[PDB]
């Protein structure tokens, strides 16, 4: 499944596509059960430790993550909506940036697809077009393919354990 | 003190500039005391009523207005940063609207200027150019300026209560 990204030119904001075999709702649980967001989040080679981790509305996340050596990066952010199996709305922040204030705000949609499929659509709007820039410039597109892979290899785990 | 809105055609945002004849600690304070808030904010004739009202990072906020007639408009955010008295970033959300998913984020930041006096820069990202416009159209542009002018009128009793 191909991971799609529009990040237009002169734009704020960043959209991605990406299909998955298996339900929403499998999906969605991948992205709210605490024990299995860790093991797909983040670029490959990266470990994610999770520090408060509340999702549902008005709950607060953040978590911290090692490269394969010993750097840490810390991120946290809000849920403005968890709505099951529909969308997650939440704020983003790299606490690793020298200014503070910078902050993205998200939203992941999950629609069902014939043969009990997912399409999942993430909406990152940025502060300003450099902070959108920013981004994709600390090799974005790369971490999120990996993720997504890493998502693909723990959603057949998940559906191996269904029946 | 004039309000400046800038609002171009096919982006996104909205950027609105203000100052107020008052230090940015007692701006700051009429964002985030409850007992302060409900007494400036919406446009004229509106009555505002509070259900939740957290100003600090990962609270949630809401809250319900009342038209000059009897209508409801309910709103409702989380807050990712409050740092007194620098800046004030969350979700704005609308619960009137009639499709779900329509959320904004809002950072408003407080600069101290010579004089004691204060400049206020609000910032709303919202999902979609359309959302952006739909916001304008609602005549936002003119209750934001009642709300600032309220806010003045509230300051000045703020400032007299000082010394």
Request: charged content about 25%; hydrophobic content about 35%; aromatic content about 12%.
């Given at each position: 499944n ?9 734009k704020?904001e960043?959209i991605?596509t990406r299909e ?19 093991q797909?989040?983040?670029?490959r080679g ?6 408060i ?7 607060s ?19 403005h ?14 606490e690793?940036?020298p ?7 998200d939203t992941?949609?999950?629609?069902a697809?014939?043969?009990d ?11 300003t077009?450099?902070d959108?820039?920013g ?7 790369e971490?999120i393919?990996?993720?997504?892979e890493?998502?693909?290899?723990l959603?057949?785990k998940?559906?191996k354990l269904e029946?």
């Open positions: 191909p991971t799609r990204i529009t990040a237009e030119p002169g704020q960043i991605i998955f075999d298996a339900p929403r709702e499998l999906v969605f649980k991948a992205f709210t059960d605490p024990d299995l967001y860790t797909w989040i983040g670029p990266f470990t994610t430790a999770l520090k981790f509340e999702p549902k509305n008005g709950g996340w953040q978590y911290i993550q090692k490269d394969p050596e010993g750097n840490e990066y810390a991120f946290h952010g809000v849920n909506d968890v709505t099951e199996p529909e969308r997650i709305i939440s704020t983003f922040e790299f690793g940036l200014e503070k204030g910078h902050v993205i705000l992941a949609r999950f629609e697809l014939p043969g499929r997912t399409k999942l659509t993430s909406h990152s709007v940025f502060q077009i450099e959108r820039d981004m994709l410039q600390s090799g974005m597109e971490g393919n990996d993720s997504y890493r998502l693909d290899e959603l057949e998940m559906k029946h």
